[PDB]
């Protein structure tokens, strides 16, 4: 869920998870358009990951899972079911993706009216 999303992102990367609440066209609730930069691409991939988990019968926003932060790396588990492993994998993936990025301040609170109706495929 959102609790673990924040935690995992914080674990691996250098910045407050707040930084991704509203960034580019994809970091934030929903998302559509051309991803603006590497960060936005990470969020696009993560949005896609969450869609796949919803399609698998999981609740990515709320469902709790266990994980550990070791040397700024996320280790997933232990899992009780497949949804916990799927969600941890999604969040681990975005945490790793974002940690390798430079933050572009100009995409913080980027206006939604500039984001295109069409998006890249998942
Ligand atoms: C966005 C940017 C992330 C980057 O450069 O890496 C940044 C820079 C400096 C401080 C913060 N920053 C932090 C923090 N610990 O760095 C907490 C916090 C809380 C609210 C807030 O304002 C807003 F508008 F971004 F929510 C901004 C907040 C974020
Ligand atoms: C869960 C929902 C997925 C949806 O609709 O799209 C959502 C809502 C708001 C922000 C994010 N969201 C995304 C994202 N894929 O949009 C990346 C990310 C990274 C850290 C983070 O931390 C915090 F604190 F903002 F929650 C929040 C983050 C996700
Ligand atoms: Ca999103």
From Swiss-Prot:
Active site annotation, chain numbering: 46, 91
EC number: 3.1.1.4
Binding site for Ca(2+): 26, 28, 30, 47
Protein's cellular compartments: Secreted; Lysosome; Cytoplasmic vesicle, Secretory vesicle, Acrosome
UniProt cofactor note: Binds 1 Ca(2+) ion per subunit.
Activity regulation info: Inhibited by methyl indoxam.
Residues bearing attached sugar chains per UniProt: 71
Reactions listed under catalytic activity: a 1,2-diacyl-sn-glycero-3-phosphocholine + H2O = a 1-acyl-sn-glycero-3-phosphocholine + a fatty acid + H(+); 1-hexadecanoyl-2-(9Z-octadecenoyl)-sn-glycero-3-phosphocholine + H2O = 1-hexadecanoyl-sn-glycero-3-phosphocholine + (9Z)-octadecenoate + H(+); 1-octadecanoyl-2-(5Z,8Z,11Z,14Z-eicosatetraenoyl)-sn-glycero-3-phosphocholine + H2O = 1-octadecanoyl-sn-glycero-3-phosphocholine + (5Z,8Z,11Z,14Z)-eicosatetraenoate + H(+); 1,2-dihexadecanoyl-sn-glycero-3-phosphocholine + H2O = 1-hexadecanoyl-sn-glycero-3-phosphocholine + hexadecanoate + H(+)
GO biological process: arachidonate metabolic process; arachidonate secretion; axon guidance; cellular response to leukemia inhibitory factor; cholesterol homeostasis; defense response to virus; erythrocyte maturation; fertilization
Disulfide bonds: 11-69, 25-115, 27-43, 42-97, 48-122, 49-90, 58-83, 76-88
Main location: secreted
Expression by tissue: Found in spleen, thymus, peripheral blood leukocytes, pancreas, lung, and colon. Expressed in neuronal fibers in dorsal root ganglia and in peripheral tissues including stomach, white adipose tissue and prostate (at protein level).
Superkingdom in the source lineage: Eukaryota
Enzyme type, top EC level: hydrolase
Cofactor(s) this protein requires: Ca(2+)
Molecular function terms, GO-annotated: 1-alkyl-2-acetylglycerophosphocholine esterase activity; calcium ion binding; calcium-dependent phospholipase A2 activity; phospholipase A2 activity; phospholipase activity; phospholipid binding
GO cellular component, as recorded: acrosomal vesicle; extracellular region; extracellular space; lysosome
Family: Belongs to the phospholipase A2 family.
Name by which UniProt lists this protein: Group 10 secretory phospholipase A2
Organism: Homo sapiens (Human)
Organism lineage: Eukaryota, Metazoa, Chordata, Craniata, Vertebrata
Name of the encoding gene: PLA2G10
């Amino acid at each position: 869920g959102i609790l673990e999303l924040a935690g995992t992102v914080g674990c691996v990367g250098p910045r407050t998870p707040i930084a991704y609440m509203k960034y580019g066209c994809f970091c934030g609730l929903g998302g559509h358009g051309q991803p603006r930069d590497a960060i936005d691409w990470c969020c696009h991939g993560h949005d896609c990951c969450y869609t796949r988990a919803e399609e698998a019968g999981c609740s990515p926003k709320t469902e709790r899972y266990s994980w550990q932060c070791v040397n700024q790396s996320v280790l997933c588990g232990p899992a009780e079911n497949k949804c916990q492993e799927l969600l941890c994998k999604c969040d681990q993936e975005i945490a790793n993706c974002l940690a390798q990025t430079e933050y572009n301040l100009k995409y913080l609170f980027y206006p939604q009216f500039l984001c295109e109706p069409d998006s890249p495929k998942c």
